[PDB]
Coordinates of C-alpha atoms in Angstrom, one line a residue:
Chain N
X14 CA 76.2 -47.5 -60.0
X15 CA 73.6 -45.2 -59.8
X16 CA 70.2 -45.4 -58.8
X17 CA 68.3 -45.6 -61.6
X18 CA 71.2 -48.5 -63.0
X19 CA 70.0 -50.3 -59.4
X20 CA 66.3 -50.3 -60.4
X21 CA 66.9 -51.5 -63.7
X22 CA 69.5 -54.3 -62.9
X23 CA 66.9 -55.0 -59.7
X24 CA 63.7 -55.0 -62.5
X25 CA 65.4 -57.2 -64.9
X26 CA 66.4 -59.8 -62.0
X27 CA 62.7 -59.8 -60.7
X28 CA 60.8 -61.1 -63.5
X29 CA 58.6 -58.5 -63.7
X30 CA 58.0 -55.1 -64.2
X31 CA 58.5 -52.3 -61.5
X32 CA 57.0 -48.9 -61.2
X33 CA 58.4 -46.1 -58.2
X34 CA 57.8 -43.0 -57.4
X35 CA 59.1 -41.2 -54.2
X36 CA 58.2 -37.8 -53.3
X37 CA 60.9 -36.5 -50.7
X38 CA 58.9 -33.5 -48.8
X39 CA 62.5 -31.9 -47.3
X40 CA 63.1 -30.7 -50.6
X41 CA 60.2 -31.7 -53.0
X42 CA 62.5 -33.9 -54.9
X43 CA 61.8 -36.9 -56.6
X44 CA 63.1 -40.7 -57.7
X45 CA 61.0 -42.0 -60.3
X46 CA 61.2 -45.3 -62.4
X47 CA 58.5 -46.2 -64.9
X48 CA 56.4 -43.5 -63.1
X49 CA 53.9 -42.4 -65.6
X50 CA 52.9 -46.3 -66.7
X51 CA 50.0 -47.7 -65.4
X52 CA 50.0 -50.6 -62.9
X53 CA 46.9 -52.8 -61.3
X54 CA 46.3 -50.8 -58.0
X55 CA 45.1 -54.3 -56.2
X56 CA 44.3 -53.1 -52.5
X57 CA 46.4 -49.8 -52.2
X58 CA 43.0 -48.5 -54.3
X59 CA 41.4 -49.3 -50.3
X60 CA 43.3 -45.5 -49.7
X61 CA 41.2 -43.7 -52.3
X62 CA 38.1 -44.4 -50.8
X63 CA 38.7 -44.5 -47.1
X64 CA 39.9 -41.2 -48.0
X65 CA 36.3 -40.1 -50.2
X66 CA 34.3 -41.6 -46.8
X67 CA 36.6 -39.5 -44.6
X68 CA 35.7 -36.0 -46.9
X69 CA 32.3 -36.9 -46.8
X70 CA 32.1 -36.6 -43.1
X71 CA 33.5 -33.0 -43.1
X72 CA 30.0 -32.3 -43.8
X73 CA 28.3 -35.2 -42.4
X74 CA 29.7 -35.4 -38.6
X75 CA 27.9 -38.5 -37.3
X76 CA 29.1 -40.2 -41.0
X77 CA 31.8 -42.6 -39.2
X78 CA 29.3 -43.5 -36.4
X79 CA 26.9 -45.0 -38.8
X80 CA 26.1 -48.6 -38.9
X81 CA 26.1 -50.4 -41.6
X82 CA 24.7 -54.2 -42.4
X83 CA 26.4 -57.2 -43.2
X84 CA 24.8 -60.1 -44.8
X85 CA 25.7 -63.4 -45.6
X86 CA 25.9 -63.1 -49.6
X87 CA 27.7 -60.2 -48.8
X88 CA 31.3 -61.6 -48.2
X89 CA 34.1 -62.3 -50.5
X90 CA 37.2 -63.4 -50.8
X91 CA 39.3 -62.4 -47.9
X92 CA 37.0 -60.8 -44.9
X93 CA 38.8 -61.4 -41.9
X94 CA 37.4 -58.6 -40.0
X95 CA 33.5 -58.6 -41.6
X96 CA 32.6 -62.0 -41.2
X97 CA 32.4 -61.3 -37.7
X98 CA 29.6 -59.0 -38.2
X99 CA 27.7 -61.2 -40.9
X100 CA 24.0 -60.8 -40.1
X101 CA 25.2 -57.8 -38.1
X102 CA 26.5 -53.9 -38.3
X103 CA 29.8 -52.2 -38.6
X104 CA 30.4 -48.9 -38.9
X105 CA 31.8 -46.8 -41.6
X106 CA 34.9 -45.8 -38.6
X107 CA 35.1 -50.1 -38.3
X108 CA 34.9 -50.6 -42.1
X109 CA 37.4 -47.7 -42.9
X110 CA 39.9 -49.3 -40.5
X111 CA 38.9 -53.0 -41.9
X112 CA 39.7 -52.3 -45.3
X113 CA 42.6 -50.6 -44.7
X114 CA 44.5 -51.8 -41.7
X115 CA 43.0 -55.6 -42.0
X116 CA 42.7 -55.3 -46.1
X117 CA 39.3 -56.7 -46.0
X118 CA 37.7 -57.0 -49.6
X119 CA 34.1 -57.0 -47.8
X120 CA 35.2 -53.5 -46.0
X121 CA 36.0 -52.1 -49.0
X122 CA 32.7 -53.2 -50.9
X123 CA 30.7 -51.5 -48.5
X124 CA 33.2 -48.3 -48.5
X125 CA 32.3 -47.9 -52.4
X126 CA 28.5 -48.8 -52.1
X127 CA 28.9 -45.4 -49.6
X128 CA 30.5 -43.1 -51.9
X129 CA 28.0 -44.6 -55.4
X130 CA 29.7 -47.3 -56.8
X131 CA 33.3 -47.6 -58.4
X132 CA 32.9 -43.8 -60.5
X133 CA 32.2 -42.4 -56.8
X134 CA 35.8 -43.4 -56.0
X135 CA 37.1 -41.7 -59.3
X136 CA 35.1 -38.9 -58.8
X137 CA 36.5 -38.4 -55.3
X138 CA 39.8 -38.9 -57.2
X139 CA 39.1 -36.1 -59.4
X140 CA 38.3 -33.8 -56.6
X141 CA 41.5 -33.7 -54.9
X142 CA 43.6 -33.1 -58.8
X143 CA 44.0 -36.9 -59.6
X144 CA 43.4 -37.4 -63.3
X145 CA 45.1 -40.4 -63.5
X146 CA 43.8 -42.7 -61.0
X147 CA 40.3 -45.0 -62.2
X148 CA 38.6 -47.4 -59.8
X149 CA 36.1 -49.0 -62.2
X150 CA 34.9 -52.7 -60.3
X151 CA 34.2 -53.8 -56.7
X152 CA 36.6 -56.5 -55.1
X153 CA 37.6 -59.2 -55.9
X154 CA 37.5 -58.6 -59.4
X155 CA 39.3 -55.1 -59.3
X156 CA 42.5 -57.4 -58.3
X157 CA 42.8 -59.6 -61.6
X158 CA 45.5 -57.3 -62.9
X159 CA 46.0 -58.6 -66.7
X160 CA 48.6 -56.7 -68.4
X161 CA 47.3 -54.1 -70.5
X162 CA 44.2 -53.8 -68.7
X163 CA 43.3 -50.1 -67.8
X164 CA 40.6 -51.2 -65.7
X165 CA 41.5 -50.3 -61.7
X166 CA 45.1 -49.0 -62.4
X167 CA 47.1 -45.7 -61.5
X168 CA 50.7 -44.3 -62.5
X169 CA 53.2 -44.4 -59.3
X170 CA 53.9 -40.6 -60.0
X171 CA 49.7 -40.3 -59.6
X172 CA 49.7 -42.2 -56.6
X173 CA 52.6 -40.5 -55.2
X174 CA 51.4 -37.0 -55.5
X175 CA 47.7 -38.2 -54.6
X176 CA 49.4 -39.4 -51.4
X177 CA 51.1 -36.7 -50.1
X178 CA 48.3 -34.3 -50.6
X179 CA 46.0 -36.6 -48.5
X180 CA 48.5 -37.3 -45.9
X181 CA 50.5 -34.4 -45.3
X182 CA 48.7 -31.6 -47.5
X183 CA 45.1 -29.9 -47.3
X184 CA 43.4 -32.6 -49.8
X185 CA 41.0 -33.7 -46.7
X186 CA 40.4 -31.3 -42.9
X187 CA 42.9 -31.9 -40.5
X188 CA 40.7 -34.0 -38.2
X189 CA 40.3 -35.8 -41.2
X190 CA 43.9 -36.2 -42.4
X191 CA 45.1 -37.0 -38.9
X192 CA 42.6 -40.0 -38.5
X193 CA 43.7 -41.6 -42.1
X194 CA 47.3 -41.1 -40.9
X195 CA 46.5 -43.4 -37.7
X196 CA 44.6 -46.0 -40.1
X197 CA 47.8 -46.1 -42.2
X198 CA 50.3 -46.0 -39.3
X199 CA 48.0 -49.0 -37.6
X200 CA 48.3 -50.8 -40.8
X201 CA 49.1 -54.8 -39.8
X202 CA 50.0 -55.7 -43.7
X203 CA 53.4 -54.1 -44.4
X204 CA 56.0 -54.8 -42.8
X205 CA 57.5 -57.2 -45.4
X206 CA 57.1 -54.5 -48.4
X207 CA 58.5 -50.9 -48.1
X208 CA 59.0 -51.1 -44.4
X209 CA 61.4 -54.0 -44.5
X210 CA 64.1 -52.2 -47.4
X211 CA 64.3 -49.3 -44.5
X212 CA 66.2 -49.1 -41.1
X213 CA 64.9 -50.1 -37.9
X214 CA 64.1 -46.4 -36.4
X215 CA 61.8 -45.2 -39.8
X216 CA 58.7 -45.3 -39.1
X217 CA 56.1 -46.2 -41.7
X218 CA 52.1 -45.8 -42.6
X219 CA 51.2 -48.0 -45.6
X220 CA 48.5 -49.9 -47.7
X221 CA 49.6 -53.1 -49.2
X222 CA 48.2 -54.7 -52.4
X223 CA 49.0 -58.4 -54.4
X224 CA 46.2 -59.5 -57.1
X225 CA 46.6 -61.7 -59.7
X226 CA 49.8 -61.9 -62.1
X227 CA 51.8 -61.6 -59.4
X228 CA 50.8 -58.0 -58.5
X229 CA 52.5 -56.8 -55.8
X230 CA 52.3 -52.9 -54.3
X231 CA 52.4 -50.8 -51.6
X232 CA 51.9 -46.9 -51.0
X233 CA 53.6 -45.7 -48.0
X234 CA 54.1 -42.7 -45.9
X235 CA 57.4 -42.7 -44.5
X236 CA 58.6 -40.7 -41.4
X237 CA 62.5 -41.1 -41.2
X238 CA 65.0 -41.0 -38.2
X239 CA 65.5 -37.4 -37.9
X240 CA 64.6 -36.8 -41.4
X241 CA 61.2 -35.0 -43.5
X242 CA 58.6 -37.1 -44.0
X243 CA 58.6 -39.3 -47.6
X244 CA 56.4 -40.6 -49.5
X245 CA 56.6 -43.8 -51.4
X246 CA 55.2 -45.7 -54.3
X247 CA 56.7 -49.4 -55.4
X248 CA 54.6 -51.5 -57.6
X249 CA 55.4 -54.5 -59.4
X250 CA 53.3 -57.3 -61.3
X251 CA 54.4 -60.4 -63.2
X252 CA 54.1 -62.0 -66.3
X253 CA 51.7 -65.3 -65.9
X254 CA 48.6 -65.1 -64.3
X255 CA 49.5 -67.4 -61.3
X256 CA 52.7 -66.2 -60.6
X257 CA 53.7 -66.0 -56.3
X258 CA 53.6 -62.4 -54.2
X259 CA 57.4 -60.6 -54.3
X260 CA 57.2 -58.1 -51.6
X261 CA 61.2 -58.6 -50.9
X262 CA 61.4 -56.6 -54.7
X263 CA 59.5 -53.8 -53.2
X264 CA 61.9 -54.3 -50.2
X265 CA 64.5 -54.2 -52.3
X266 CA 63.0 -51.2 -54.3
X267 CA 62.9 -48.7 -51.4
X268 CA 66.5 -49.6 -50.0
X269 CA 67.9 -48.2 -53.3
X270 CA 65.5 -45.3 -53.3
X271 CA 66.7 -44.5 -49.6
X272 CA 70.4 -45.5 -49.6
X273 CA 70.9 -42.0 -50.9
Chain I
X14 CA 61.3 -86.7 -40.0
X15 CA 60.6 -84.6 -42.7
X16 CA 59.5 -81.2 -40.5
X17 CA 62.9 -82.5 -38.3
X18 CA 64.4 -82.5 -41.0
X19 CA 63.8 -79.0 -42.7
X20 CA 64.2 -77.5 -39.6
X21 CA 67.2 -78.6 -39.3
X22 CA 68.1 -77.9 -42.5
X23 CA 67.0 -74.1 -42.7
X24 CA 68.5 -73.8 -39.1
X25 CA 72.2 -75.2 -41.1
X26 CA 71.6 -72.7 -43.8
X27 CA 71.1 -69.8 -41.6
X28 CA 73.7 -70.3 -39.6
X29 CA 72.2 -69.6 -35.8
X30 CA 70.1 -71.3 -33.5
X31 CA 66.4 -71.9 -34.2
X32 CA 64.0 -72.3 -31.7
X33 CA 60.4 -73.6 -32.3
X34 CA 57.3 -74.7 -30.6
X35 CA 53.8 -75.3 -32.4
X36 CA 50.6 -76.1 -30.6
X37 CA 47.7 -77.5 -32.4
X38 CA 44.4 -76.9 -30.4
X39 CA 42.5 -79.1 -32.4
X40 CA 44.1 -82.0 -30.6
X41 CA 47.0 -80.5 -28.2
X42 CA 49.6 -82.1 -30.6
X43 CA 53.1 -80.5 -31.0
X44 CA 56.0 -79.7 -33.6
X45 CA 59.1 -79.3 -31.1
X46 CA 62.8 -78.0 -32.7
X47 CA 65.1 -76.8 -30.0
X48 CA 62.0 -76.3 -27.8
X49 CA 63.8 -76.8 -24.3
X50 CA 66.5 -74.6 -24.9
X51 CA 66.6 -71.3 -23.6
X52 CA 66.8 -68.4 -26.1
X53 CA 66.6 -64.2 -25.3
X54 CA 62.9 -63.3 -26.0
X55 CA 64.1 -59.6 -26.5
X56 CA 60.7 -57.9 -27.2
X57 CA 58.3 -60.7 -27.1
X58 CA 58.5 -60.3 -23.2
X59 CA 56.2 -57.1 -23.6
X60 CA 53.7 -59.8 -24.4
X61 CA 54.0 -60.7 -20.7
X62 CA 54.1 -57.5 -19.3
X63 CA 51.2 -56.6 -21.3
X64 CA 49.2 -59.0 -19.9
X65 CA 50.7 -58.9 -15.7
X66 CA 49.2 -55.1 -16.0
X67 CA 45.7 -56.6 -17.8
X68 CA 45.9 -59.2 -14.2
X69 CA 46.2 -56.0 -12.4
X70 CA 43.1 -54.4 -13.4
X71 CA 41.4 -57.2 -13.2
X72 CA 41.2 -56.3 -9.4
X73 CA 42.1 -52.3 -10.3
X74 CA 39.2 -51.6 -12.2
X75 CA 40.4 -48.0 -13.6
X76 CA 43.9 -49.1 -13.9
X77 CA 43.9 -48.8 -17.8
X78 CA 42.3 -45.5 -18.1
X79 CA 45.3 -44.3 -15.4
X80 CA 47.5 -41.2 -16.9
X81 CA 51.0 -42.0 -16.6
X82 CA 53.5 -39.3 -17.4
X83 CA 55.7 -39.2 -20.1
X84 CA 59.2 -37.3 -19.6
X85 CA 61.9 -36.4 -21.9
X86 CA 64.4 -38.1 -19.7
X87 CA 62.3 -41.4 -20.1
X88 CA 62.5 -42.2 -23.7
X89 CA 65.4 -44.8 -24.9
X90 CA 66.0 -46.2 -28.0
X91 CA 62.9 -46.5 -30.2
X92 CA 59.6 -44.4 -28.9
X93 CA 57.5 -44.5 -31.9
X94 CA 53.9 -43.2 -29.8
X95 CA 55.9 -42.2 -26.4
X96 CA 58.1 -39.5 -28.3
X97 CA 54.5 -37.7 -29.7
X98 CA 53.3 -37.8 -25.7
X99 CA 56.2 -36.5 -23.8
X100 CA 55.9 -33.5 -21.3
X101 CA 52.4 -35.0 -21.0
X102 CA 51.0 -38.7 -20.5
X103 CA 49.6 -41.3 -21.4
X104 CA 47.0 -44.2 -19.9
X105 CA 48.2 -47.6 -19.2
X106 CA 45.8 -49.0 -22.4
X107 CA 47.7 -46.9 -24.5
X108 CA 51.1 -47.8 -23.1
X109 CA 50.3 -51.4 -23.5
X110 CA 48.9 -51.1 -27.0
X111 CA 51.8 -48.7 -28.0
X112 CA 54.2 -51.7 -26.2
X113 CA 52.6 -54.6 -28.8
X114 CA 51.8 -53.3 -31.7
X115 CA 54.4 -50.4 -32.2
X116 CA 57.1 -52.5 -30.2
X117 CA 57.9 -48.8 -28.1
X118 CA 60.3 -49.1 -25.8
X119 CA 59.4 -46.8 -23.5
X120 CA 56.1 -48.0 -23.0
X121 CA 57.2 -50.7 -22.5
X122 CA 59.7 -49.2 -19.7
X123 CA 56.1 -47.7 -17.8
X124 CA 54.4 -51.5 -17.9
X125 CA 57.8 -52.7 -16.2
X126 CA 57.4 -50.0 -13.8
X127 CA 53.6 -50.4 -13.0
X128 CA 54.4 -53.9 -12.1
X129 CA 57.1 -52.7 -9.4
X130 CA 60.3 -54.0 -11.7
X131 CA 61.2 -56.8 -14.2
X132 CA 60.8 -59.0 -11.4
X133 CA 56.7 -58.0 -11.5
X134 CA 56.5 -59.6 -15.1
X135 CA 58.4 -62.6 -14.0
X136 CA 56.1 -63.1 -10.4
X137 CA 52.9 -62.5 -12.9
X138 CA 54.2 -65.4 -15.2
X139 CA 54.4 -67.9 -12.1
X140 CA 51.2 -66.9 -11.2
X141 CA 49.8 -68.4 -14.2
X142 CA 51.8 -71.5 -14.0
X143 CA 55.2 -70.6 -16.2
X144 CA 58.3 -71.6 -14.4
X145 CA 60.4 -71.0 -17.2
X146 CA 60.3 -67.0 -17.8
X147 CA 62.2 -64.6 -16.6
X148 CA 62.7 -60.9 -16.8
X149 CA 65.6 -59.7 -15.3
X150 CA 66.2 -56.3 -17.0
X151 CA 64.3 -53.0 -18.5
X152 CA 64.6 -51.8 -22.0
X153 CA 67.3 -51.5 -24.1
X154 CA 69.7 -54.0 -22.1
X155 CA 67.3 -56.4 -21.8
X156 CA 67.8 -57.4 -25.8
X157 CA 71.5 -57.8 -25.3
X158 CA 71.3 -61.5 -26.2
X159 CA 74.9 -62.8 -24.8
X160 CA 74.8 -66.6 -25.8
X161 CA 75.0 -68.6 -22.5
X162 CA 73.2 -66.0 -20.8
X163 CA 70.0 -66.6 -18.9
X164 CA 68.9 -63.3 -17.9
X165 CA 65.7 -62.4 -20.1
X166 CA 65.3 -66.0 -21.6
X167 CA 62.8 -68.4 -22.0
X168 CA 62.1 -72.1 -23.7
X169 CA 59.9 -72.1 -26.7
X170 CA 58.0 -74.9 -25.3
X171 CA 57.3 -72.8 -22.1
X172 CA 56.3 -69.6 -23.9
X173 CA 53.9 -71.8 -26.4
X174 CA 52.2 -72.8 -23.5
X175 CA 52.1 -69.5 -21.8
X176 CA 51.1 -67.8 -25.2
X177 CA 48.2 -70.3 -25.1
X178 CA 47.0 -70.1 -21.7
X179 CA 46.8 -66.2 -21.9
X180 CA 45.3 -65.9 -25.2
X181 CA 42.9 -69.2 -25.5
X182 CA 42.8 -70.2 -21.3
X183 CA 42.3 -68.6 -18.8
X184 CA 45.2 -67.4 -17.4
X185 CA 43.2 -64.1 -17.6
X186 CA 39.5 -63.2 -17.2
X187 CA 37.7 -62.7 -19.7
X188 CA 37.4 -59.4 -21.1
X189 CA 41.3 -59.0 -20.6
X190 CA 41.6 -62.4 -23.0
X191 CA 40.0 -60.4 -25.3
X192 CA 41.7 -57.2 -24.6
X193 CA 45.0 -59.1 -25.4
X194 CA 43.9 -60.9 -28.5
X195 CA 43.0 -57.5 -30.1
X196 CA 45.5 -56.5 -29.5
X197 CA 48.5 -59.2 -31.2
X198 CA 45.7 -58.7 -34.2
X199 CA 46.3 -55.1 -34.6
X200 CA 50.3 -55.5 -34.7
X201 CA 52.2 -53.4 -37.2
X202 CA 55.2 -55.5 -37.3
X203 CA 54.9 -58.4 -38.1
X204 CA 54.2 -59.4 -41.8
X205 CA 57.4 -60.2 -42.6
X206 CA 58.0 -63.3 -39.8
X207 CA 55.4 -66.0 -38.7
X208 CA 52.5 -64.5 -41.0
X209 CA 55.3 -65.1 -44.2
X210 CA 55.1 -68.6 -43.8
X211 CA 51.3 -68.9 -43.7
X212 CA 48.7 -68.8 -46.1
X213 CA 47.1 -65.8 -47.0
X214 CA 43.5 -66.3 -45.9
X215 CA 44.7 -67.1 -42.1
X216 CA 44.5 -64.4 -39.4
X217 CA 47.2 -63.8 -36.9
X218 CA 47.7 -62.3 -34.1
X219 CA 51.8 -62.0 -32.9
X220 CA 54.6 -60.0 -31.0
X221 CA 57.7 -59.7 -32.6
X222 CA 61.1 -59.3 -31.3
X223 CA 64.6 -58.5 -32.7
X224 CA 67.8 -57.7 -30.2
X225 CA 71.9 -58.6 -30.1
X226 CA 73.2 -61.5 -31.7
X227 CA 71.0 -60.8 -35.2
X228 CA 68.0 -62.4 -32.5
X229 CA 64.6 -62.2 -34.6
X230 CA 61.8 -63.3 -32.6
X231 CA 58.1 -64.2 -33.1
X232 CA 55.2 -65.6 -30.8
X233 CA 51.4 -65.9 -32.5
X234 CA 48.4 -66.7 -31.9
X235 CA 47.1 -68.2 -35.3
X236 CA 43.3 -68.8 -36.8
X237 CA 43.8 -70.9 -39.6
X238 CA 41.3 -70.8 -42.5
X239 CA 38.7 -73.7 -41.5
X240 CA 40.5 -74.7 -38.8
X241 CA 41.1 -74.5 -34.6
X242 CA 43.5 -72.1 -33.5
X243 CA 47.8 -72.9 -33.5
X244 CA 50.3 -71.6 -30.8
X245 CA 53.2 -70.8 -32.6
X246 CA 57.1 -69.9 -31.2
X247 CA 59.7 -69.2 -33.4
X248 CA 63.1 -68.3 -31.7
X249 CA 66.2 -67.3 -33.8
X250 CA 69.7 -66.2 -32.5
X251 CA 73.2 -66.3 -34.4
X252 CA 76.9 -66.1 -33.8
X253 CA 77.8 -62.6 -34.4
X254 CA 77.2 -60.0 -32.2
X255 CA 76.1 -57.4 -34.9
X256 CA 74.3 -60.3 -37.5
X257 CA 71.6 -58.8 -39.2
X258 CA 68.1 -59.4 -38.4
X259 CA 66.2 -62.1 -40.4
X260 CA 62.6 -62.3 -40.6
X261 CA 62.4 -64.5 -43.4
X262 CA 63.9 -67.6 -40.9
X263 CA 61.0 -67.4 -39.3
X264 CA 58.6 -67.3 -41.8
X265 CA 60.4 -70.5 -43.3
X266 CA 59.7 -71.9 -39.8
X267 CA 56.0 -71.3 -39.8
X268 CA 55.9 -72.6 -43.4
X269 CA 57.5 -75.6 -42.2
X270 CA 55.7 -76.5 -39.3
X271 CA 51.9 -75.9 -40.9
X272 CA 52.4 -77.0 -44.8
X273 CA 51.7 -81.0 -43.3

């Protein structure tokens, strides 16, 4: 019947274990659904420190403009944007948009060697009120999601909140906030997650995630027909280690949050 | 014929008409389903337009920077970036990158204008050696999608061919190649249709397009991991006039035609 009936019947029909959290900014109310458990972050973590390279620029201007190298042993797992650049430079503005809009793993590396390591990423976390979000490895390893692992994890109520206040509230300068909302709006990943349980005319800014057990996510900032701006948190992860990518759940997931 | 075969198959499932053409450029060979039938491109013709107005500057050499304005009275029925810009303008660049990777209408609407009509777009495509094309409308009728109707149709086989010759050839010069390869790589909307069906280390580049007649549309330009570059069309159209869209046909199509 209700909604929170259509997340459970859609949870135990999935295989695995869901986690949402929308935030709905006409009225500050919320839909929630295992929102204070932890789930493997995977790639939407990419957000966090975009976010920590954009605050550091407040007070370093030329920050985005700076090059950075590339190198060979450098790569990972999926750097569709950086191997380009191997033996070369891209800058912290190219990395920010390759880690985000491209979700390279290299991209993000280099984001996190910029703000100190993993703790620079939580410590930026911190800054802004989140107490619940850790980054605590580089990629690819931060993806292996094993149940029960707190390593690299965040609640979807966290993530929500963290969200809004770095897309719509005062967490970063408004220069600042508008450029992470292009990055997110640009975002090539999504359109099968979130975006695809909406209608046609919503328009969406997102970060994707999938890692291992099946670990499926995505954060998004929605901006509805006519309607305040949302924001949205599905995650989901599975119970074998190998198990296949279900974005159609998170589909699924936010055309029951936003039926009604 | 196995890929015959499942082709056929999901095509029976679905219950519409599929369309596909796949172009391997490691050897020119081909995966034909449908591929001389005509189907409505809806907005995979902004690929087209797109590229007539990169032709254009290739002897206009400020074209793209060009301010074009933006009225209230222009905007139809999705205007995603032209709806932030009205009661000012915006450059032919932006219109173009507006057109491919946030599917806006209206920007579309100025490219169809700058080229003096739909009949511009359709002169451009026999310039570089597609007999097949043609635009006969602006946005939103030309997505109407009547079956047995040729306005705003084209074959798969043709628009492989084209896809290839403006993205790989040299249907443009070079910089404007380029230009239009970034482009398809920096879509938003297409995750959920060709890219579905490939694996997830291969980088794609792809217009999408979705009209009357539950039509669902994709053309890419596809770098496989390891391997030469693919051409792939995937066409869909069905019975009903309000059928729903479905992105996941397509994304069956792709898996098809690459899994060899």
């Amino acid at each position: 019947a209700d909604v929170q009936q259509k997340l459970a019947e859609l949870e135990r029909q999935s295989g695995g274990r869901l986690g949402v959290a929308l935030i709905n900014t006409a009225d500050n109310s919320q839909i929630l659904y295992r929102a204070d458990e932890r789930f493997p972050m995977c790639s939407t973590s990419k957000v966090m420190a975009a976010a920590a390279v954009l605050k550091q620029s407040e007070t370093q201007k030329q920050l985005l403009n700076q090059p950075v190298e590339i190198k060979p042993a450098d790569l990972v797992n999926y750097n569709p944007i950086a191997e380009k650049h191997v033996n070369g430079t891209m800058t912290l503005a190219e990395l920010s948009a390759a880690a985000l809009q491209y979700t390279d793993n290299t991209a993000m590396n280099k984001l996190i060697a910029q703000l100190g390591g993993p703790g620079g990423v939580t410590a930026f976390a911190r800054a802004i009120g989140d107490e619940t979000f850790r980054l605590d490895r580089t990629e690819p390893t931060l993806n292996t999601a094993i149940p029960g692992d707190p390593r690299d994890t965040t609640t979807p109520r966290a993530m929500a909140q963290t969200l809004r206040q770095l897309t719509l509230g005062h967490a970063l300068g408004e220069t600042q906030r508008a450029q992470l909302v292009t990055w997110l709006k640009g975002n090539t990943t999504g359109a099968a997650s979130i975006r695809a349980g909406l209608p046609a005319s919503w328009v969406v800014g997102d970060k994707t995630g999938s890692g291992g057990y099946g670990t499926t996510n995505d954060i998004a900032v929605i901006w509805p027909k006519d309607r305040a701006p949302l924001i949205l948190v599905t995650y989901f992860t599975q119970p074998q280690p190998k198990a296949e990518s279900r974005r159609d759940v998170l589909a699924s997931a936010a055309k029951i949050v936003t039926d009604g």
